[PDB]
């Protein structure tokens, strides 16, 4: 996860992949400026540091 | 011995924001002012981090950086991850009256799966025996990917020495060709039956003889 | 905006001494940080030298200690950089480096530059093989032409085909590294083959350590 | 609607249909206990009162 609307209290997780509220605006559910996907993958390479 | 460590190849992803590291040992680097380079592949390098917090004039505002001293590490982050991000990135900073610049952090990544090698022999001719030399030049291109291995074959022996072989370099065609090149005298050439140069590939195999009669 | 040209390179020498010059304009010289900066070729940035904005202050990497040399003038607005002493190490492309108010706010200021390589053990006169594949059937790589550039030190050398004539199909292999640690070559034409008797080739091989410049006719066997 | 997380300002309506939390513990946004659909469906008849 990248976004989250505050901090997390200890010992506690969250399973819901809903899309991360970061302007005033509302993008009414879809993908587009001001709202994103706030779980986020990584990369992984054998001859990283 | 002051230095700056930071990774060579992250931010391989499309369209979201990821943060890339430098960290430095020595010393801690919130004392002195770190910069950030984006350099262009083959041009001129330029800047896109100074002072630490602010922008050059006409720079996107999609790149953003922040400071922690729990880690002693600084954190640059690029939000928009646009068409224009193929760079490599170095953290600069200062200790005493020198300048300490970071390794590099490559950024490039933001129809037929199999194709026949072409190889070609080119037999020495009458020119270049009369001056006591043969070169016999083993070719081969468009394969892939670029993993082969070339070897010579003689009437009832394999050759060891006089062989070299260059790696595979970059064409014009989304394809790769290498080159290999060998020595040999002319008593050998006309003492042998026939000549093969062969290349293996991913389970492919391609043989190819010639004769010494002209 | 801001202009700068840098024009010191474009020769090789063991351990001699080099000149490097860079030329800036459109603003003070005699007012901000100037310093010096090259990098390796494939390798990442490292520093090399700093001076002073009227050049009472100058100062280098250890490395470089001992050697190197630094000065400038505000009459006509220009750097100066000598060296001495040079190692292989030393193939790298020179930026000049501006500053603005110190060595805290940062390079931001990287020139085009000049490349820079060293190569030793002199030279020695190439070779030159333009063979001539009379017999040959279709369906190959090469139709039916060839040349040979070997036993030539160092790199590189300027390969041209009928005095630049033709440009279309011409593919060049890179050298290759032998036993001795010799370079050698071959660059290749698609030409039809109705051509051979009727179209003279001009196999043209160029070297700039050894100024020959040799000219060799085609002809099939 | 018989559910909200809170109470409605005044001239708001909302849209989005998601899972009902009432409890402590998530149900990872599948049907069983501890939570439901908030949304409802309703039933007429013509003889009632």
Request: proline share 5%; hydrophobic share 30%; glycine share 10%.
């Given at each position: 996860r990248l976004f989250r609307k505050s901090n997390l209290k200890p010992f506690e997780r969250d399973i819901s992949t809903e899309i991360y509220q970061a302007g005033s605006t509302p993008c009414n559910g879809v993908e587009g400026f001001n709202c994103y996907f706030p779980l986020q993958s990584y990369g992984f390479q054998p001859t990283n540091g | 011995n002051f230095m700056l460590t930071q990774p060579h190849s992250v931010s391989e992803s499309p369209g979201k924001t990821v943060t890339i590291s430098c960290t430095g040992s020595?010393?801690?680097?919130?004392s002195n002012y770190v910069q950030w380079y984006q350099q262009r592949p083959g041009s001129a390098p330029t800047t896109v981090i100074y002072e630490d917090n602010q922008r050059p004039s006409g720079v996107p505002d999609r790149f953003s950086g922040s400071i922690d001293s729990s880690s002693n590490s600084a954190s640059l982050t690029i939000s928009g991850?646009?068409?224009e991000d193929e760079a490599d990135y170095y953290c600069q900073s200062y200790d005493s009256s020198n300048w300490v610049f970071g390794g590099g952090t490559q950024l490039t990544v933001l129809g037929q799966p199999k194709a026949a090698p072409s190889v070609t022999l080119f037999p020495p001719s009458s020119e270049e025996l009369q001056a006591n030399k043969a070169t016999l030049v083993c070719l081969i291109s468009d394969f892939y990917p670029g993993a082969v291995t070339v070897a010579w074959k003689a009437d009832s022996s394999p050759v060891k020495a006089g062989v070299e072989t260059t790696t595979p370099s970059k064409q014009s065609n989304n394809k790769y060709a290498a080159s290999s090149y060998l020595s040999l005298t002319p008593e050998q050439w006309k003492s042998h039956r026939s000549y093969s140069c062969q290349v293996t590939h991913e389970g492919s195999t391609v043989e190819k003889t010639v004769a010494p009669t002209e | 905006e801001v202009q700068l040209v840098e024009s010191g390179g474009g020769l090789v020498q063991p351990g001699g001494s080099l000149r490097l010059s860079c030329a800036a304009s459109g603003?003070?010289?005699?007012?901000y940080w100037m310093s010096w900066v090259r990098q390796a070729p494939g390798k990442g940035l490292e520093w090399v030298a700093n001076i002073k904005q009227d050049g009472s202050e100058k100062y280098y990497v250890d490395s470089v200690k001992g050697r190197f040399t630094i000065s400038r003038d505000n009459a006509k607005n220009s750097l100066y950089l000598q060296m001495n002493s040079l190692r292989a190490e030393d193939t790298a492309v020179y930026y000049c480096a501006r500053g603005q108010l110190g060595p805290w706010v940062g390079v931001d200021y990287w020139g085009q530059g000049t490349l820079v390589t060293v190569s030793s053990a002199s030279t020695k006169g190439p070779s030159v093989f333009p063979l001539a594949p009379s017999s040959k059937s279709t369906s190959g790589g090469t139709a039916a032409l060839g040349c040979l550039v070997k036993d030539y030190f160092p790199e590189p050398v300027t390969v041209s085909w009928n005095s630049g004539a033709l440009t279309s199909g011409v593919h060049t292999f890179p050298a290759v590294l032998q036993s001795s640690g010799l370079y050698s070559l071959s660059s290749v034409v698609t030409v039809?083959?109705?051509?051979?008797?009727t179209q003279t080739y001009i196999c043209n091989v160029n070297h700039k350590p050894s100024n020959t410049k040799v000219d060799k006719k085609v002809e099939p066997k």
């Open positions: - | 020595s010393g801690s680097i919130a991850l646009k068409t | 603003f003070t010289f005699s007012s039809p083959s109705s051509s051979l008797g």
